[PDB]
Amino acid sequence: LEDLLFYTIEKIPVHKFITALKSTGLRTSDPRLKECMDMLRLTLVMLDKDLFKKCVQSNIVLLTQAFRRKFVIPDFMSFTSHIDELYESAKKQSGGKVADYIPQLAKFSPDLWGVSVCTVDGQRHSIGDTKVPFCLQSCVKPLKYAIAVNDLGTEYVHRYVGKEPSGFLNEDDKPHNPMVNAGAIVVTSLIKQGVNNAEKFDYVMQFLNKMAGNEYVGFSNATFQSERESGDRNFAIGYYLKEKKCFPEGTDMVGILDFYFQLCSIEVTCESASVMAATLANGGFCPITGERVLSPEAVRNTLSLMHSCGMYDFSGQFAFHVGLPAKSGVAGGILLVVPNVMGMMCWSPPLDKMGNSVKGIHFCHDLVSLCNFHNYDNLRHFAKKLDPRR
Amino acid sequence: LEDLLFYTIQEKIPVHKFITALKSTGLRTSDPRLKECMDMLRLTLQTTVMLDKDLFKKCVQSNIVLLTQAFRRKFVIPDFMSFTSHIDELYESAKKQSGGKVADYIPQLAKFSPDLWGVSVCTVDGQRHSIGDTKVPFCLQSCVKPLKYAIAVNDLGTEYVHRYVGKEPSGFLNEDDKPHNPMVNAGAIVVTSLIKQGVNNAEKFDYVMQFLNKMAGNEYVGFSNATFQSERESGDRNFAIGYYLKEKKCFPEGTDMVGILDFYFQLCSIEVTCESASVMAATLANGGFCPITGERVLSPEAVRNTLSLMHSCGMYDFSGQFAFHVGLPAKSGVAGGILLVVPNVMGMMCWSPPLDKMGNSVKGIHFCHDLVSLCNFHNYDNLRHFAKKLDPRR
Amino acid sequence: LEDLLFYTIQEKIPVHKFITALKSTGLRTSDPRLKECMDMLRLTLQTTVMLDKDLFKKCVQSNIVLLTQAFRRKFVIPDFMSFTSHIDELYESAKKQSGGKVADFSPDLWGVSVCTVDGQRHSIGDTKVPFCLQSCVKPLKYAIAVNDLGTEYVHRYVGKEPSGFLNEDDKPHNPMVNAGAIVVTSLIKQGVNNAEKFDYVMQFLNKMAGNEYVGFSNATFQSERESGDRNFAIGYYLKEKKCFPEGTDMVGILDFYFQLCSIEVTCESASVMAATLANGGFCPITGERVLSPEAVRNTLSLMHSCGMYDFSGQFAFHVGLPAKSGVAGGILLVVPNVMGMMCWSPPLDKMGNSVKGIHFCHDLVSLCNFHNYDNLRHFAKKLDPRR
Amino acid sequence: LEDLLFYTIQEKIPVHKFITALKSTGLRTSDPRLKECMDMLRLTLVMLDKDLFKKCVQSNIVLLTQAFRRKFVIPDFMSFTSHIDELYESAKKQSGGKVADYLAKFSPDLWGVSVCTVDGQRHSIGDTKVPFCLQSCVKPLKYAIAVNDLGTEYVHRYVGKEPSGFLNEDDKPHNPMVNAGAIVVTSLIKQGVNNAEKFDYVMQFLNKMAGNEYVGFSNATFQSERESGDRNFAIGYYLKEKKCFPEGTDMVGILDFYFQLCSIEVTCESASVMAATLANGGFCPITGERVLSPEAVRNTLSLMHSCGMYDFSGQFAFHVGLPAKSGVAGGILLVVPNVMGMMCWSPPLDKMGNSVKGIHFCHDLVSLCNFHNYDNLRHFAKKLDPRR
């Protein structure tokens, strides 16, 4: 196992192993690599059979699979080369306008652009401004919906909200889906019922942590305050939803919107969020931690509704061309999921008429032109498309 | 080579025991890709029941690759015999769903017994299974919409086709005045206008028929003149659509709209069985390559576009719900057929005449829900973690 | 002058004889226009029961003109007694229709008040029972806005046409829908608090009613206030689309809005308001000009098209009279140039309109040609009260 | 009787003097109801005395008395037509809008306004006697015939009573004023008969309404409507599909009848009598004949009010406050209930599909006079009332 892996790389200089590992896409920071990385820390510049396996033994299974090219993208280093090329073609689109409707959204420089990819195997790549935290805004919708369905199951959740695109309420007298603001609001009321906004938020927060594999998650109070004061439309919705009895019994609405606004102000970076999208691409299992955050039905349902409802008015166009479930938000983030392969976060503040990141949208189209990630792309015949999984 | 495979089935090998092993891969002896081998076997049985290396290699030599993959269980569904057994269970479960009304609006659709129910599977590897009434021919009707839309996009390309017709569900014309998509009648009619322009219907129809043959691997494709006459006569709302389309200039220049409507009804009147249709379905599942004949019928462009639209628009008003729960591109028609594609896996046709309020076959819809509950074919199901679903792929 | 009148009713005229002929013109002795004359009779009765050219003239002098037109049969309904006879018959017929559901007031409560443009009054049923204007206030308050701010201003904020939340211009559809009524409410007496606002609208409402009963139900207000989720939704959507005038406090505007819906009237009191619109802005009993013709016309047009909720198209077609209904069960009904009236029954039909009222309005038009498009010269079988 | 009249008009009465007086009440010597009295005048034909006057005038003295005793709706007509002129001139200066090309022959310069009161008083200015197709203006007329023969309950079994805002909740067209409804109405009239007979009937009906003034048919327009009528065929098949026609209806035929109806020709003059008939409660003002039941006239006016102007109907009914019908030929059939009716014709149409000049004229008409539905008769403020 370890021995086998040992030769694969009479004495192994650590830095040689480190690079070999970093080329598989895995990060030394990987939670699943801790024991091995610690063991390396302990020993620390060259390793031998007995010793190597001493460090590696604990993680050997994951290390073997990285080195013996069994990850979803066998050649990651090449794949990231294309990601960079794509990232840069999109960088060249300066159009669109940053949402100014609140000061926190206005602050952001138009030229912040980043793409963070995390596969279902935990292979990571980043380019651009990945580490800059920004608000999930509408990107939180699929996430909290996932939490909702995960906790309460599909049937309960959809007693309250619809399964399809509108085209305020539908014929059943419920919001059309969780991706619209009315739907999202209703969903917000389903999560952790009978508890105060503080604990509710803590719960959701801890849940987003699991999804991120404990990568950066935060809260913008500045954004929250601005969301609250300027939230007149959301209030109009709340009051309508209340009058239509769309909420669970014993719901304090004004609280649900307070809660709702908070979720929208939850902060992420491209990195942290790409892992969240990976958890969705991995069937509920966080790729880096390996823990099961969400139930498959919750993930399935979410991926469905990001497909149909995800892009706002660009959803149909998006689904037809990109053919991938994705979530957009006013922050300029696009949470993009390629099922069974990877997930990613694209962030640029400038948005188009539809309200989606211009660069992100551009990048998504490009990404799918290049590789066959399109839902209806065929695995055996994809014509001239590049397949990163081979 | 073949040689290795001989040991993969004693010194001398009964012919019938080679057959049953082959037939168990889900493959059929009728397979066009098996012909050279199947013929050597039939010929050899003349020169007489049993074989030896050299004699075996004599028969299997041409088709070994396919035969090797089959006996090396390298096909999509490695255990086909087990998978089909589940299909039969789901079939029986749906057979118990007698609700729904057969479409009476014309004599040809009313002629059908409410109890005609069949399912046919064809994988991308040519593995076949059928149960219920597979052999009974019925009109595609709306099941033809994706197929003819595939043809247009194949010939004319995405960009052109969608100048005339839209890419998304309606939710008569969209904002740009094009029909909403190829899946609605307004769209299907427009698309019908795009195929084989500048020729008379007879040749247009023949072209479309050629195409359909290739897609069915030359299995049964036919025409019901009875239905065509009745579609023609009763087609008032299609004509309304035709005139609105002409008035709105949705058709290409020089289009003859009354003729395009004749062509349209003709296409709706094209006949298939569950078997022949399931192969057409598997082609879309196979990225444009007919799973049984190995020929490339459709461009990946066309196939992808079609699957997307069948996903969003294919189930009528049950589309949103269908895509959510079943999560497979599918197409329903008044005939009671459901053209179902599981990408990268297989394709199938479920046929029952009784329709639900949405217009979809009751037993079909029921079967499709069940199908996805059992196995993870749902678009967004995970290949690694599908919980307690079963995965025929392994 | 009055001389003539004298001989129109022997050497001496018993007073009762004068009152009874007067009350037959449909006029009421309480008519503010009759005050002087009636004051004089009560005084003469103190200085005692008969009148004479000099005594008479002394009483009827001040009021002659009205009293003259009254007895020259020159009012709009020349024969009132015979008209009110039919109203009573129409009342009893509609009374027999008990279908409908009360808002959640007895279901049995039903009543009709007629006030013509000449001040002629008739009342039957429970007409003194006070009830909330509710949506019946919408036209009245729109009339105030148009009156004060002019047509062009008011309609910068709200639309003139039936809906078919906001229209293409992002204004509410009209003053008759809630969104439109809430916006309109925002137009009246800007820059002042709700107390002074409410008074202003109330004094206006008093003039329209000829100072007849106008009141406010706080019980209703508190209810409409807590249960108002629908309107608060509308208030925020309105605020979000900037449909209000700059510097509007919407939460305050909504409170004002609930206040206007809670204003109480009676069938009688209200019928005068209706007759005011029928009179081109002049309260028929006082003679004061309450509203501008511009305002009165705009209101009637919108009551015609938008007034009955979803029954507007059907009501305007068949009845052809501008009218407004409210959840309280009242129907504000105006016959232009003729009269105005208030039908009130609590039980409502599926449309939100009073079962009895709606029935009455249909009956009314079938009998008399008041229909917008009925003809004055050839009405066929319809009776014409103006002759 | 007539003796009374005679003194009103010295010992003897030069005929021309009676003419000009007669013509000044707005009446026309061409007036059908004056026929007997006009006959007698040429019979005698340059002065008249009692006997002789009473001889010629006796015939119709009730009309001549009313006219000369200013008992007509507009007592001072000669003043009123002066304002109509001013209004006409004011409107004639609107050069905006486009002629319907889809008629192009018609010069955009053509503008005319014909007035006919409920008393038979006539006035014309601009291009009155140029014939033009009713087109959509025929819809209310068509509907009135239907409701006249078939009654309210039957006609509205097939078509709706209210504005749209293709079919309504009941699956019937929204009203007679939309092509869908108009087509349906057309299938209602004179059923069980061939289009040749159907057309003759509607033609005779329209004649009545016009008091036998010009009514005609443009085959040119008709052929063109048929060839370009794809929209109407689409509607036709949809109606057929939804079973909106009476059973046994030949849908393709109806469309043809429909096309023919839109191609019927009127002049501002003949058409104003039609509108006047609708203003007079179904009685043709000039003939005196009863053409339409009050039921039909009332229903027609209601629907013209709400549905008449296309998308401008709401804006129109609000401001103008008069029932009217507009058409692609640039015609506007305008009805003032109980007062008069008129046709305003200019080819160029605004974005709404309404005659630019006509619309402009109507607005001016109601600003000047209180003909507005909800204008008050006692207090109109600063408006002008032709009825006094």
Q: Report how far residue D264's alpha carbon sits from residue A88's, in angstroms, rounded to the nearest whole number.
A: 68
CA–CA gap between residue A134 and residue A127 (Å, rounded): 16
The annotation places the binding site of B for substrate at: 142, 185, 231, 238, 264, 316, 334
Q: How many whole angstroms separate alpha carbon B5 and alpha carbon B64? A: 9
Please state at what angle helix B15-23 crosses helix B64-71, rounded to 10 degrees.
Answer: 70
Give CA–CA dist B350/B339, Å, rounded.
Answer: 7
Nearest residue of chain B to residue A373 (CA atoms): B304
- Measured CA to CA, the distance from residue B63 to residue B57 in angstroms comes to 10
| Cβ <8 Å between A237 and C233 | yes
At D260, the amino acid letter reads: Q
CA distance A138 to A180: 9
Facing residue for C237 by CB, picked from A236, A242, A243: A236
Calculated CA dihedral for residues C142, C145, C150, C156, nearest 10 degrees: -80
CA distance B134 to B151: 25
Cβ distance B19 to B85 under 8 Å? no
Contact between residue D169 and residue D136 where contact means Cβ atoms under 8 Å apart = no
Given in angstroms, what resolution was this structure solved at? 2.8
CA dihedral over A27, A30, A36, A42, signed as positive or negative: positive
DSSP assignment, residue D175? -
B59 and B93 in a single domain? The answer is no
A78 with A60, same domain? no
Q: Do A378 and B287 touch (CB under 8 A)?
A: yes
DSSP, collapsed to helix, strand or coil, labels residue B357 as coil
Does residue B50 contact residue B15 with C-beta atoms inside 8 Å? yes
Q: Are the CB atoms for D321 and D366 separated by under 8 Å?
A: yes
Q: Say yes or no: C287 and C374 in one domain.
A: yes
CA atoms of A179 and B320, how far apart (whole Å): 14
Same domain, A273 and A294: yes
Contact C240 A242 (CB under 8 A): no
Q: Checking DSSP bridges between strand B118-123 and strand B346-351, what pairing results, if any?
A: antiparallel
Residue A260 assigned to a binding site: yes
Alpha helices in chain B (DSSP H): 2-6, 15-23, 35-44, 53-60, 64-71, 80-95, 107-110, 144-164, 185-192, 201-216, 225-234, 236-247, 257-268, 274-285, 300-313, 319-325, 362-374
Q: Which amino acid type is present at position A315?
A: S
CA B330/CA B307 separation, integer angstroms: 8
Using CA atoms in the order D133, D139, D141, D143, what is the torsion angle rounded to 10 degrees?
160
**Residues in A 261-290 with any Cβ partner in C closer than 8 A:** none
The 3-class secondary structure across A248-305, one letter per residue, is: CCCCCHHHHHHHHHHHHCEEECHHHHHHHHHHHHCCCECCCCCCECCCHHHHHHHHHH
Which residues have a Cβ under 8 Å from the Cβ of B14 and sit 6 or more positions away? B49, B50
Supply φ then ψ for residue A347, to 5 degrees: -130, 115
CA-based nearest residue to A187, from A241, A250, A236: A241
Separation in Å, CA of B32 to nearest CA in chain A: 20
Q: What letter would DSSP give residue C245?
A: P
Which residue type occupies D178? V
Q: Measured between alpha carbons, how far is A145 from A166 in angstroms, rounded to an integer?
A: 17
**Is C257 flagged in the annotation as binding?**
yes
Residue B22 contacts by C-beta under 8 Å, 6 or more apart in sequence? B29, B34, B67, B70, B71
What radius of gyration do chain A's Cα atoms show? Answer: 22
- As a whole number of angstroms, the distance between CA D159 and CA D189 comes to 13
Residue of A nearest to B285 (CA): A378
Which token pair is D146?
């239907």
Q: Could you say which of D70, D86, D120 is where a domain stops?
A: D70
Nearest CA to B351 among B331, B370, B372? B331
Task: Please give the DSSP secondary-structure letter assigned to residue D216.
Answer: E
- CB pair distance less than 8 Å for C336 and D161: no
Question: Which residue type sits at D358?
Answer: G
Cβ C374 vs Cβ C320: under 8 Å: yes
Q: d(Cα A17, Cα A20) in Å, to the nearest integer?
A: 5
- The verdict on D230 touching B (C-beta cutoff 8 Å) is yes
Would you call C106 exposed, middle or buried from its count of C-beta atoms within 10 A (0-12, 13-18, 19+)? exposed
Backbone angles phi, psi at D340, to 5 degrees: -160, 180
CB contact under 8 A, B247 and D235: no
Residues of chain D with Cβ-Cβ distance to C337 below 8 Å are: 376-378
Do residues A213 and A32 touch, judged by C-beta distance below 8 A?
no
Q: State the Cα–Cα distance between residues C308 and C330, nearest whole angstrom.
A: 11
Tell how many helices (H) and how many strands (E) occur in chain B.
17, 8
Please check whether residues B104 and B2 belong to one and the same domain: no
Question: Which residue of chain A has the CA closest to C232?
Answer: A239
Structural domain including A112 reads 70-390
Quickly count: other Cβ atoms within 10 Å of residue D278's Cβ. 32
Q: Please state the separation of Cα B394 from the chain's center in Å.
A: 23
Residue type, B298: L
- The residue type of A58 is S
Contacting residues of C for A243, CB less than 8 Å apart: 229-230, 233
Q: CA-CA distance, D2 to C190, in Å (whole number)? A: 66
Q: Which residues of D touch B237 (CB under 8 A)?
A: 237-238, 241
Whole-number Å distance between alpha carbons of D61 and C12: 46
Chain D nearest-CA distance from C159, in A, is: 10
- Determination approach: X-ray
| Nearest to C372, CA basis, from D5, D323, B267, D244 | D323
Q: Residue A121: closest CA among chain B residues belongs to which residue? A: B384
CB contact under 8 A, C377 and D338: yes
Alpha carbons B258 and B280: distance in angstroms, whole number? 29
Alpha-carbon distance C297 to nearest alpha carbon in chain D (angstroms)? 5
The sign of the torsion formed by the CA atoms of B4, B7, B11, B12 equals negative
Judging by DSSP bridges, how do beta strands A97-98 and A350-351 pair with one another? Answer: antiparallel
Question: D114 and D62 share a domain?
Answer: no
Single-letter amino acid, residue A301:
N
Residues with their C more than 2.5 Å from the N of the next written residue in chain D, i.e. before a break, are 9, 45, 102, 165
Q: Does C237 touch chain A (CB under 8 A)?
A: yes
| Contact partners, residue D279, CB within 8 Å, separation at least 6 | D117, D118, D285, D335, D336, D337, D338, D339, D340, D341
C window 180-219, beta carbon within 8 A of D? none
User: How near does any CA of chain A get to the CA of B385, in Å?
Assistant: 5
Give B111's contacts (C-beta < 8 A, 6+ positions apart).
none
**Is residue C226 less than 8 Å (CB to CB) from chain A?**
no
CATH code (residue A122):
3.40.710.10
Q: Can you list the alpha helix ranges (DSSP code H) found in chain C?
A: 2-6, 15-24, 35-46, 53-60, 64-71, 81-95, 137-149, 151-157, 178-187, 194-208, 218-226, 229-240, 250-261, 267-278, 293-306, 312-318, 355-367
What is the Cα–Cα distance from B322 to C367, expressed in whole angstroms?
A: 58
Helices (H), chain A: 2-7, 14-22, 34-43, 49-56, 60-67, 76-91, 103-107, 140-160, 181-190, 197-212, 221-229, 232-243, 253-264, 270-281, 296-309, 315-321, 358-370
Q: What is the CATH number of the domain that holds B50?
A: 1.10.238.210
User: How many CA atoms lie within 13 Å of A215's alpha carbon, on the beta-carbon side?
Assistant: 31
- Smallest CA-to-CA distance from B35 within B383, B294, B361 is with B294
C178 is in an annotated binding site: yes
* Residue C24 and residue C103 in one domain: no
Determine the residue type at D369: C
Number of domains, chain A:
2
The closest of D314, D338, D310 to D326, measured between CA atoms, is D310
Q: Are residues D66 and D200 in the same domain?
A: no
C-alpha span between C215 and C209 (Å, rounded): 11
Check whether residue D56 and residue D83 sit in a common domain.
no
Q: After which residues is chain C discontinuous, taking C to N > 2.5 Å?
A: 9, 48, 104, 164
- Out of A69, A84, A101, pick the residue that ends a domain: A69
Residue D200 φ then ψ, to 5°: -60, -40
Report the Cα–Cα distance between both ends of chain C, in Å, rounded.
Answer: 25
Chain D positions touching B242 (Cβ under 8 A) are 234
3-state helix, strand, coil split of chain B in percent (to 5) is 50, 10, 40
Interchain contact, B380 vs A319, CB within 8 Å: no
Contacts 24+ apart (CB under 8 A), D198-202: D198/D257, D199/D257, D199/D260, D199/D261, D202/D142, D202/D145, D202/D261, D202/D264
Domain boundary among B43, B73, B103: B73
Question: What is the crossing angle of helices A253-264 and A221-229, to 10°?
Answer: 130
Contact B343 A376 (CB under 8 A): yes
Task: Output the DSSP codes for C272-330.
Answer: HHHHHHHTTSB-TTT--B-S-HHHHHHHHHHHHHHTTGGGHHHHHHHT-S-EEE-TTSE
Contacts of D175 (CB under 8 A, 6+ apart): D159, D160, D161, D162, D163, D164, D181, D303, D306, D307
Q: Does C320 touch chain D (CB under 8 A)?
A: yes
Residues whose CB is less than 8 angstroms from the CB of residue A202 and which lie 6 or more positions away in sequence, other chains included: none
Same domain, B90 and B100: yes
Distance CA B286, CA B76 (A): 11
Sheet containing C339-344, strands listed edge to edge, beginning at the edge strand earlier in sequence: C121-125, C111-116, C339-344, C330-335, C323-325
**CA–CA gap between residue C234 and residue C1 (Å, rounded):** 60
Interface with chain B: mutation pick from D179, D238, D242, D245, highest number of B CBs within 10 Å: D238
Candidates C105, C135, C109; CA nearest to C312 is C135
Same domain for D124 and D10? no
Residue-wise DSSP of D265-320 = EE-HHHHHHHHHHHHTTSB-TTT--B-S-HHHHHHHHHHHHHHTTGGGHHHHHHHT
Sign of CA dihedral C71, C76, C78, C81: negative
CA distance D185 to D254: 10
User: Quick one: residue A293, left, alpha or beta (phi over 0 = left, psi -120 to 50 = alpha)?
Assistant: alpha
Partner-chain residue, chosen from D165, D294, D317, that has the shortest CB–CB distance to C164: D165
* Residue B203 amino acid letter: E
Q: Please report all neighbours of C, defined by 3+ CB atom pairs within 8 A.
A: A, D
CB within 8 Å: D162 and C313 = yes
Q: Is C337's CB within 8 Å of D377's CB?
A: yes
Parallel/antiparallel/unpaired status of strands C263-265 and D340-345: unpaired
Q: Are B100 and B356 in contact (CB under 8 A)?
A: yes
Q: What is the dihedral of CA C275, C277, C278, C283, to 10 degrees?
A: 50
The residues near C63 (Cβ < 8 Å, ≥ 6 apart) are C33, C34, C35, C36, C37
- The answer to whether the CB of A312 falls within 8 A of the CB of A141 is no
Nearest to B286 among A164, A303, A378 (CB): A378
In sequence order, what are the residues at sequence separation of 6 or more whose Cβ sits closer than 8 angstroms to the Cβ of residue B196? B155, B203, B204, B207, B208
Main-chain phi, psi angles of A380, to 5 degrees: -90, -40
Chain C contact present for D330, CB below 8 A: no
Strand order in the sheet with A124-128: A124-128, A114-119, A342-347, A333-338, A326-328
Task: Indicate whether D240 and D114 sit together in one domain.
Answer: yes
Cβ contact (<8 Å) for D240 and B236? yes
Distance from CA of C163 to the nearest CA of D (A): 7
The separation between the first and the last C-alpha atoms of chain D, rounded to the nearest angstrom, is 25
DSSP single-letter state for residue B336: S
Question: C179 in contact with D at a CB cutoff of 8 Å?
Answer: no
d(CA C33, CA A345): 80
Q: Whole-angstrom Cα distance, residue A249 to residue D72?
A: 71
